Design a protein around this nucleic acid. Structure first.
Ligand code: MG
Ligand code: MG
Ligand code: MG
Ligand code: MG
Ligand code: MG
Ligand code: MG
Ligand code: MG
Ligand code: MG
Ligand code: MG
Ligand code: MG
Ligand code: MG
Ligand code: MG
Ligand code: MG
Ligand code: MG
Ligand code: MG
Ligand code: MG
Ligand code: MG
Ligand code: MG
Ligand code: MG
Ligand code: MG
Ligand code: MG
Ligand code: MG
Ligand code: ZN
Lengths: 116, 60, 155, 82, 99, 126
RNA sequence: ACUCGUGAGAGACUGCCGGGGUCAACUCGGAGGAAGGUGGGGAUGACGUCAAGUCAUCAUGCCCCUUAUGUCCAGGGCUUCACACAUGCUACAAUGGCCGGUACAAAGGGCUGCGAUGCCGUGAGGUGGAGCGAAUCCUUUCAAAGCCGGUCUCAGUUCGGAUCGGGGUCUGCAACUCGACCCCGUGAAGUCGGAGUCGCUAGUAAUCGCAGAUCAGCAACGCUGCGGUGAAUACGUUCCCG
């Protein structure tokens, strides 16, 4: 299926189909499906348009999803990097902000490994 | 241990979070037992001399 | 071992059937010390093989064991700076142990998407002569017959 | 994060300094030695000279950076690279 | 029917047994019913200490502290027995609790 | 009244024999309900099979401590001991079978400098 | 009348029998017995070697500072990073993840400390606080693996959880360098691994839990201890190390 520009998987359980939406994850999907009363084990083959549309209505009314989320994320990044904050300088240097052990770990943030 | 510092620690600190152990016999800051008030080496010496009433070698 | 041969444990017999081979198989397939779970695996695979083949499970088990058990093994030793392969006969007990080990190892590496199924299919293939264990024994005997020229070392 | 029930903590001496400063309406460089005091909307148009371990670095504070401690905008360690 | 919990605390078996005996003889002399020194789980405290200062941690030493606790459940608390228990002196190694 | 006791790895059990039927009472429930494991049933019933006196003895069990296997071993040992006590005639055969011999193995001491029991920590020559 | 906890005693000494042995040590087998040939484990380091480690536990000979290299206080640092090595945890999935029902242990701690029942929070936690200086009250009736029922059909996946944003609780006068925990978004590398190399011979290997020291908060995946389920193999010293 398709929703908000997101191609719902051909055959996947809704608990992860809603997870694939960038603004909703595992526990958010669990709470949303609990609230709507929808079974979390059924397959995509039985999906219907009206329930999907009302779910879209609820999620857009109560939450912000996709491009808006991105935009406030980069807005936060730019304001923090402009105000000279510690997190701003860490983003400038491309390093973790919490201040983990940069000695050996943090390869995830530092990206590929290059030898000298 | 600097005697100035050990006497200072004995002196009542201006705040409740600034108190710590400072083993009495030698003033070692690290590795000190709360119950005995003595550190590792002091406990070793007292136990081996047998002057501490209750400590003995353990073998079970 | 230097002082002498150590005693061997008195393995106990299976109550469900009465064959120590089943006990040996469950012991070999034991993983992370889950005895009951391994026994359940073995019983389920045996029942599946029985229902697929329509024959006696113990009978087909001995058939596969006799088909796949080896007779000769190759040992390595270095003489004059050159490493040579020397073959030597193997006793029946170790032959059976190696047969069971091969059965388990080549049941490990099938692609049936389910281990309880893979074990049964490997047993059937070994029984009918199309098993990876059978191929392994073929290769072992081929290597022994090819490199038995150095038998005069007798070590 | 500071608990909401207790509320933000501000040094008494620094609070008095800013209060007298904004009562007199004069804007000058305040010799600030508290890296712990949190910022309050009353710091809209004041300048603080915080201590970085070597010398006082003056920093201008506006409404943009509300909700952060003083030490966030004053780097402590210099890293020139390799 | 009144019962008093006479608790004995000590570190050494010889002295705790001697104190319990002494209590038994004095109770018998005064003529009161006592169950005796019923056994209890003894407290065991284990402390581990590094062998030497400045690293060298692969070797350690372990220490133990044993305290023996005995209960003397005295029944029919005769005032003479109570006064005798009060004025009987015990070694410092043995502690007597009256309750 | 007749009484017996068995021990295996801190598993202490109480067993009393009755001349009744062949019912097993383990803390108010049957052998199948309590510890439903074929190994446990066979190890519990082995001494009775060896003696060949099936279905005229009732046992009532009070259990404390240990685990499933330990309790099963303690029960088998206790019933063997009670069998010998009630009928010493079969004692030679049962002892030859090996049911009256207590099993003197359990968890051993943990020694400092190691991880547990006897396992050696990772020791490298580097 | 049995465990139970803690006092005394008995019990393994080649004790006896048969054969080898110089009729000697010692050895093989057998009977009794809980154990048979130091039953299992711990405490236990001879003369000396490595000018081994420690003037930062402490003590000490000599030199050095004494108006300083002694001393108070505010802030910062000991947690910095384009890299390299060592020790552990999490995995790489079906002997499995998740959801519901369901039974078995040991030992230890508790005074300026444990914290019951009840009420509200998804849950960290907020109110209150009986019972305890402790076989009694709390650490949940000490659990987890285990057993039964349903989904997943081999996917970078319902496996896997780091990184980055948005909200709170708790100890602390003091959480931005610089704590932990709870709620959410976030979905990266990783499909059993190169020469080479390490541990282990019975309750052992492996796997799964619990408690304590230091401590108000914790960098606790470390150390110390207490446990559940529980293997395979040893033909024999030619080759590697001592
Ligand atoms: Mg402190
Ligand atoms: Mg200390
Ligand atoms: Mg090393
Ligand atoms: Mg020497
Ligand atoms: Mg030296
Ligand atoms: Mg030297
Ligand atoms: Mg000195
Ligand atoms: Mg100085
Ligand atoms: Mg520092
Ligand atoms: Mg450091
Ligand atoms: Mg893990
Ligand atoms: Mg469950
Ligand atoms: Mg709640
Ligand atoms: Mg429970
Ligand atoms: Mg994941
Ligand atoms: Mg996981
Ligand atoms: Mg990968
Ligand atoms: Mg793949
Ligand atoms: Mg290789
Ligand atoms: Mg801590
Ligand atoms: Mg134990
Ligand atoms: Mg264990
Ligand atoms: Zn000391």
């Amino acid at each position: 299926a398709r929703l908000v520009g997101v191609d719902l998987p051909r055959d996947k359980r809704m608990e992860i189909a809603l997870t694939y939406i960038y603004g909703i994850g595992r526990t958010r999907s669990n709470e949303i499906l609990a609230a709507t009363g929808i079974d979390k084990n059924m397959r995509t083959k039985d999906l219907t348009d009206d329930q999907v549309t009302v779910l879209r209505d609820y999620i857009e009314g109560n939450l912000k999803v996709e491009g808006d989320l991105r935009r406030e994320v980069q807005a936060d990044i730019r304001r923090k990097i402009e105000i000279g904050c510690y997190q701003g300088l860490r983003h400038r240097r491309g390093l973790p902000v919490r201040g983990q052990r940069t000695k050996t770990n943090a390869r995830t943030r530092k990206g590929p490994k290059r030898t000298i | 241990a600097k005697k100035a510092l050990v006497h200072k620690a004995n002196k009542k600190p201006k705040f409740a979070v600034r108190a710590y152990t400072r083993c009495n016999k030698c003033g070692r800051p690290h590795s000190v037992y709360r119950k005995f008030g003595l550190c590792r080496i002091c406990l070793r010496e007292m136990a081996h001399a047998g002057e501490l009433p209750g400590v003995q070698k353990s073998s079970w | 071992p230097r002082k002498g041969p150590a005693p061997k444990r008195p393995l106990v017999n299976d109550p469900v059937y009465g064959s120590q081979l089943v006990t040996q198989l469950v012991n070999k397939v034991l993983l992370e010390g889950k005895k009951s779970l391994a026994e359940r695996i073995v019983y389920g695979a045996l029942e599946q093989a029985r229902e697929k083949t329509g024959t006696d499970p113990v009978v087909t088990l001995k058939r596969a064991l006799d088909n796949v058990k080896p007779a000769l093994e190759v040992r390595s030793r270095r003489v004059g700076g050159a490493t040579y392969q020397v073959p030597v006969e193997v006793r029946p007990d170790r032959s059976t142990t190696l047969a069971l080990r091969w059965l388990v190892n080549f049941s490990r590496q099938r692609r049936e998407k389910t281990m309880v199924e893979r074990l049964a299919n490997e047993i059937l293939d070994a029984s009918n002569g199309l098993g990876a264990s059978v191929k392994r024994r073929e290769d072992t005997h081929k290597m022994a017959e090819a490199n038995r020229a150095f038998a005069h070392y007798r070590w | 994060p500071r608990s909401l029930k207790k509320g933000p903590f501000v040094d008494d001496h620094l609070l008095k300094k800013v209060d007298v400063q904004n009562e007199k309406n004069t804007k000058q460089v305040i010799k600030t030695w508290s890296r712990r005091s949190t910022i309050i909307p009353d710091f809209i148009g004041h300048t603080f000279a915080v201590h970085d371990g070597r010398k006082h670095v003056p920093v201008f504070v506006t409404e943009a950076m509300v909700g952060h401690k003083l030490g966030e905008f004053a780097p402590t360690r210099t890293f020139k690279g390799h | 029917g009144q019962k008093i919990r006479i608790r004995l605390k000590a570190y050494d078996h010889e002295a705790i047994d001697a104190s319990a005996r002494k209590i038994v003889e004095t109770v018998t002399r005064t003529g009161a019913s006592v169950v005796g020194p019923v056994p209890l789980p003894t407290e065991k405290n284990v402390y581990c200490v590094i062998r030497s200062p400045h690293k060298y941690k692969d070797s350690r030493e372990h220490f133990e502290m044993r305290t023996h606790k005995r209960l003397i459940d005295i029944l029919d608390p005769t005032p003479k027995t109570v006064d005798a228990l009060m004025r009987i002196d015990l070694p410092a190694s043995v502690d007597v609790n009256i309750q | 009244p007749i009484q017996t006791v068995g021990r295996r790895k801190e598993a202490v059990v109480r067993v009393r024999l009755v001349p009744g039927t062949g019912q097993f009472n383990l803390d108010g429930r049957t052998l199948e309900n309590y510890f439903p494991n074929k190994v446990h049933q066979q190890l519990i019933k082995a001494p009775l099979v060896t003696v060949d006196r099936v279905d005229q003895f009732d046992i009532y069990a009070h259990l404390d401590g240990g685990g499933p296997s330990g309790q099963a071993g303690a029960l088998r040992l206790a019933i063997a001991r009670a069998l010998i006590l009630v009928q010493p005639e079969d004692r030679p055969a049962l002892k030859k079978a090996g049911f009256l011999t207590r099993d003197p193995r359990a968890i051993e001491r943990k020694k400092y400098g190691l991880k547990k029991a006897r396992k050696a920590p990772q020791y490298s020559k580097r």
